[PDB]
Amino acid sequence: MASLIYRQLLTNSYTVDLSDEIQEIGSTKTQNVTINLGPFAQTGYAPVN
């Protein structure tokens, strides 16, 4: 029981890397994400004088 769980871990550590490597490159790479605004008009007066 514990036998697994414990050992099971050290067995699946090699993974630590792959994942680890994501959040870096993943974040080192990344997409540009969008702002959803425009519910209403920005509208103001449009000339000084």
Add this chain to the structure above:
Amino acid sequence: RYEVIKENSYVYVDYWDDSQAFRNMVYVRSLAANLNSVICTGGDYSFA
């Protein structure tokens, strides 16, 4: 002294109307117009 309007003069016409739209032109962002010209010609005046 007699007055004469020439190219250095201006004519102003103030205008109001009772139309529903006019009651609407209060908070205005812009106005534009396509207006005809008119010729104003003097008549005779006799000095008795």
